[PDB]
Write a protein that binds this ligand. Sequence first.
Ligand SMILES: [Mg+2]
Ligand SMILES: [Mg+2]
Ligand SMILES: [Mg+2]
Ligand SMILES: [Mg+2]
Ligand SMILES: [Mg+2]
Ligand SMILES: [Mg+2]
Ligand SMILES: [Mg+2]
Ligand SMILES: [Mg+2]
Ligand SMILES: [Mg+2]
Ligand SMILES: [Mg+2]
Ligand SMILES: [Mg+2]
Ligand SMILES: [Mg+2]
Ligand SMILES: [Mg+2]
Ligand SMILES: [Mg+2]
Ligand SMILES: [Mg+2]
Ligand SMILES: [Mg+2]
Ligand SMILES: [Mg+2]
Ligand SMILES: [Mg+2]
Ligand SMILES: [Mg+2]
Ligand SMILES: [Mg+2]
Ligand SMILES: [Mg+2]
Ligand SMILES: [Zn+2]
Lengths: 100, 75
Amino acid sequence: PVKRRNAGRSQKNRGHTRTVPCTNCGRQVAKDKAVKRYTVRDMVDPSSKRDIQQKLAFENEKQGIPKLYVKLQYCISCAIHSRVVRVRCAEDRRIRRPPI
Amino acid sequence: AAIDVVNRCKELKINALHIKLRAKGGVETKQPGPGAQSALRALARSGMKIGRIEDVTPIPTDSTRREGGRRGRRL
RNA sequence: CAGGUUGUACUUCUUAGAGGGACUAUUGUGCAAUAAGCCAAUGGAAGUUUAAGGCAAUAACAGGUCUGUGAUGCCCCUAGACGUGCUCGGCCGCACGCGCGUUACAAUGACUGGCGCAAAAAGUAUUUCCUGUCCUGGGAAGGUACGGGUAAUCUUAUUAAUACCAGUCGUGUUAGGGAUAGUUCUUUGGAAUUGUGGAUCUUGAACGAGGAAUUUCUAGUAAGUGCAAGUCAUCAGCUUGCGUUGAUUAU
RNA sequence: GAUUAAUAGGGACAGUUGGGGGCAUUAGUAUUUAAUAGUCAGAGGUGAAAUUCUUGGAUUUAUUAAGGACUAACUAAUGCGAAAGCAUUUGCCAAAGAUGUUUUCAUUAAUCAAGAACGAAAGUUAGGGGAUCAAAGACGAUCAGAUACCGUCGUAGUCUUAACUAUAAACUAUACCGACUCGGGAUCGGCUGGAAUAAAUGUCCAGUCGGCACCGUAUGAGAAAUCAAAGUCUUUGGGUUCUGGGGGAAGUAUGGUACGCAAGUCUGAAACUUAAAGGAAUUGACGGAACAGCACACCAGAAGUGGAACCUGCGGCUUAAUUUGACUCAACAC
Ligand SMILES: [Mg+2]
Ligand SMILES: [Mg+2]
Ligand SMILES: [Mg+2]
Ligand SMILES: [Mg+2]
Ligand SMILES: [Mg+2]
Ligand SMILES: [Mg+2]
Ligand SMILES: [Mg+2]
Ligand SMILES: [Mg+2]
Ligand SMILES: [Mg+2]
Ligand SMILES: [Mg+2]
Ligand SMILES: [Mg+2]
Ligand SMILES: [Mg+2]
Ligand SMILES: [Mg+2]
Ligand SMILES: [Mg+2]
Ligand SMILES: [Mg+2]
Ligand SMILES: [Mg+2]
Ligand SMILES: [Mg+2]
Ligand SMILES: [Mg+2]
Ligand SMILES: [Mg+2]
Ligand SMILES: [Mg+2]
Ligand SMILES: [Mg+2]
Ligand SMILES: [Zn+2]
């Protein structure tokens, strides 16, 4: 019973692909296989934002607080446990560009 | 922590701090800890002006090998 | 203010038959993708499916019941019987373990007076069943003196107890609390001893609000408070119901 | 007197294309360490913690330097390589496909016992090197026990010269050359026209050859999962190597003028025993997985039982007998 046709990794036309340590655990995982999400968040709770934006010395800031950039790479056990990715029915299992 | 710092800058006559934020970085995690936000807030909460803000977290062009196993932390 | 009478009288109260009544009604630039529906305010006796119940598909669980059955298969006992009786015990026997529960640890209390507040149930194959007057006894209780009722007629449309009003008692194993005991008296029963219940003096223990745990519960509801019915000759700390006083907190 | 010139194959050549290879170069932060400055009491680490480090000043901050690795992000259902594998700059060296040819050769080809070139990791031999991690080991913790999962350390290893070794789920678990059978966009590399502009190593459009794939679909296949091959198979034959014949025994025994220093590799049995082992899929049940309902389950509360005396059931224990049924809700004031 082949489960995935992909077999989980996006790799074709090559023998080998570089291994990446998982953010959460650090387990080595295939770069194709890895659940990778790029995150641009803000360093600060919106309330905290109000508080700081009061005290910003340079008024020449328009959204003058930096965002936090993360390239987040999960091994499978981790990204499942941690709900980044979750179990779906056989038909949905092949759906490719899902979010909102 | 923050309020102690602020109280002590206040007598050094210091209005404003630039901020350089860091997580352990390098080969370790790049997500700053829980205290990050709280300390940043409590600093300004204490009536301290805030200057330019940068994240300097150590960022390998490339890494030495991670402290985990080959299989990472199990459990 | 109370009785007694009364009528081609009357229906508010009381029976209880017919028929109404509620359909989530009306309104809502309330939420609903404007659909089902939810929500609020108003009206309304009633808007939690009005409230509380009765009934309970398909499938199970070798759940329980040969001790409810003159429903039984099979097995067993069959005359000093495992049949049908009689007499005395026993099931209530106590080092202890575990469940339902009644009563308390008090002042929002206990006790002494006073006080025309219920509901729902029962009831005589004639003296036997509810029992009303009356009388005796200090009392539980006894007479039998006069009586009613197979009951909407008589017990009774009362007789309940929390509650209320006075007064005592004064934060202490105290009258809180009454377990346990010893005399007496009464009642049901041939039979009360291994106290059936009830009465009088005594006697007065634990308990100073409860470890780990854990039950039930959203409105006339919880909780307190008595009353009936089943059992029953006698025996309610049980059950099944009935009202009274009435919440805290969530929809 | 020399057949064509295979949408056969070899060769030439032309502009490209590539994270293919080998040498040199070269960068970049990062880990670790050191130096020089600072400042102070805690750093680490965990579920909590403890081993550790710390006033001889750690962690922390700034600037440099040393030393081994490693090439992030861009990074993809994209590329190259025979596979293993391959990702910093530049230069050099040889090599390659596809495309483009009104070039040349003219069957030179397909597959393949022998025999050969490669071949992750781990491991072995002789030197180097040693920053990070890190088998073994030393410790902390956890636990009934942990010689485990976690933590602090740490050797071999990890890197490198010369050599061995030949093995992996070395995986599309799918042999190679060749035909033929559906549709659709997109993608990487050539080419051919066309169009726009700010006129180009850039766009767009339409062709086409070759790649990696994908999405539909089959009145094709299959036990199915699924498969554009896993189709053109009882309507059974295009060419060629390899492998299997119930399960264990067992990749064991044994033999190897087969290999290896060794580990081991390759070759490789039978006796014996056994009725199934096995493949996909369905429905249940279960889950120390994900989601969603509902109930006084919780929410917010109340009255409390559990503590006391007594009453009344169970169980024990005595008994001549203490008749008996009924033990989680779903026995036990029944
Ligand atoms: Mg591989
Ligand atoms: Mg760690
Ligand atoms: Mg109903
Ligand atoms: Mg049974
Ligand atoms: Mg009398
Ligand atoms: Mg009566
Ligand atoms: Mg006596
Ligand atoms: Mg008594
Ligand atoms: Mg009676
Ligand atoms: Mg009873
Ligand atoms: Mg350096
Ligand atoms: Mg270097
Ligand atoms: Mg590329
Ligand atoms: Mg060596
Ligand atoms: Mg222990
Ligand atoms: Mg270490
Ligand atoms: Mg062109
Ligand atoms: Mg078919
Ligand atoms: Mg076949
Ligand atoms: Mg397909
Ligand atoms: Mg054939
Ligand atoms: Zn992980």
